[PDB]
Design a binder for this molecule. Structure first.
Ligand SMILES: O=S(=O)(Oc1ccc(Br)cc1)c1ccc(-c2ccc(O)cc2)c(-c2ccc(O)cc2)c1
Ligand SMILES: O=S(=O)(Oc1ccc(Br)cc1)c1ccc(-c2ccc(O)cc2)c(-c2ccc(O)cc2)c1
Lengths: 10, 243, 234, 9
């Protein structure tokens, strides 16, 4: 999920 | 461990929420080229797609949101994203009666909203919501509280045993945001009776925002099958989470 | 108007006495249901409940003051919300089950009988569990139900309705202050209750689309009244 | 509509 990656991106 | 959200005071809550505000984005709108069903929705989908990126990073700065697990963060944003886009749109449009300010260069009235089938009924609801904010004289400190409530509340009743402790943390942050709204209203000289009423009026609006989101979501899904409007990969994933 | 001149206790008493009754489902003993079987029992039940709701709405303080057109608009927009919160309220003392009628108590396994019915079944169960955790009182329940009636359609037309909504707000706080809750506990519980109305609106919209699909699927013939309440959301 | 009948009788 794109929402997964953007949330994980720190 | 010790949650930072539960330790913040009311004024510290407002400060954190105000500092986390996303920017107001511009659209690719060209006033030379007139509108149409395909071109206007393409502008709105392009705008909302870029807003989603800022919304995701704004949610991380909402007190208590990082304390939740990755799975719950995904669910809350999937269920509340259109609500958060709409209350921000309604908030931008307070000072422009009869018009919706999707972007500082994209100001639309209900006459131009007829260019998309079914877009009229929800355009008027967003207008009435903006008019409701106007005659209430909604404050930015109250707005950022309402927007954070939507993120935490809209998907909280659609999550077992260990995960129930995560619902208690969300309701604890929600109660602190309620304390914040009351603290703001007391500083404006409102009596105890006026604080309860205004608090109720603000939260009753969230029912209409949920309704506009439900209707808007159904319009975006049919537009997905219509193929006339290309949807971005992020919006397609957010849209599939609702059907 | 006459609703604004009522005290908080007189508001509670008027809402409690205006409560519609709890109707029974049709008494077929075949408790294993199918898709057309369960939908037939539910539409028949909801159709009869609608008649009592329309007369309950007349007895809501301030509702007779509105014109006939405004009364129609509020009922059309809120009727499924009102049915659902009533279902959730009477399902409280039956955890894990939904009491559509005293003789029609269903669990989530029976929610699989109708296609797409499990998602909203779980949402209804969660709302009932939420009411149980908050120890929701019937005096609070009738206030929430009247709020749904007056609020859900007020931004789709209003000054008089907001005056009544404030009075119901004053009534809810009066109930929480009477129960010994502190000021901080009063505004927090008010917010907790009103946020649930956002979820009830969500279940209604999902339920409305479901019934709309049941129409052109033609699994069960819908009544003319239910078809007219459904038409107002399309 | 049927709703107008029930709201009057
Ligand atoms: O379902 S709608 O009701 O339909 C319309 C369409 C055009 C007009 Br003019 C009016 C209504 C509605 C309404 C608002 C939005 C939207 C777009 C951006 C934004 O920041 C907030 C809301 C959106 C929206 C949301 C996300 C998108 O990718 C595209 C559009 C949709
Ligand atoms: O859209 S639903 O979510 O779909 C289902 C269907 C079966 C199961 Br099991 C679970 C969900 C839902 C839910 C509740 C009702 C209903 C009926 C009567 C009532 O008093 C309260 C709610 C209704 C309802 C409402 C009106 C009707 O005419 C028939 C049914 C629908």
């Amino acid at each position: 999920k794109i929402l997964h990656r953007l949330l994980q991106d720190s | 461990k010790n949650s930072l959200a539960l330790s913040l005071t009311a004024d510290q809550m407002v400060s954190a929420l105000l500092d986390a505000e996303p920017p107001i984005l511009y659209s690719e709108y060209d006033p030379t080229r007139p509108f149409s069903e395909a071109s206007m929705m393409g502008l709105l989908t392009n705008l909302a797609d870029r807003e989603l990126v800022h919304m995701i990073n704004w949610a991380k700065r909402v007190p208590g949101f990082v304390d939740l697990t990755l799975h719950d963060q995904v669910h809350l944003l999937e269920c509340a994203w259109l609500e958060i886009l709409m209350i921000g749109l309604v908030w931008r449009s307070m000072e422009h009666p009869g018009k919706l300010l999707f972007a500082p260069n994209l100001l639309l009235d209900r006459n131009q909203g007829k260019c998309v089938e079914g877009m009229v009924e929800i355009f008027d609801m967003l207008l009435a919501t903006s008019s409701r904010f106007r005659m209430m004289n909604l404050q930015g400190e109250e707005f950022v509280c309402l927007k954070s409530i939507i993120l935490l509340n809209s998907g909280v009743y659609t999550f077992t045993l260990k995960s129930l402790e995560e619902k208690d943390h969300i309701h604890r942050v929600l109660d602190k945001i309620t304390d914040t709204l009351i603290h703001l209203m007391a500083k404006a000289g409102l009596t105890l009776q006026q604080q309860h009423q205004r608090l109720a009026q603000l939260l009753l609006i969230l029912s209409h925002i949920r309704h506009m989101s439900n209707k808007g979501m159904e319009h975006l899904y049919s537009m997905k099958c219509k193929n006339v409007v290309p949807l971005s990969d992020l919006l397609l994933e957010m849209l599939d989470a609702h059907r």
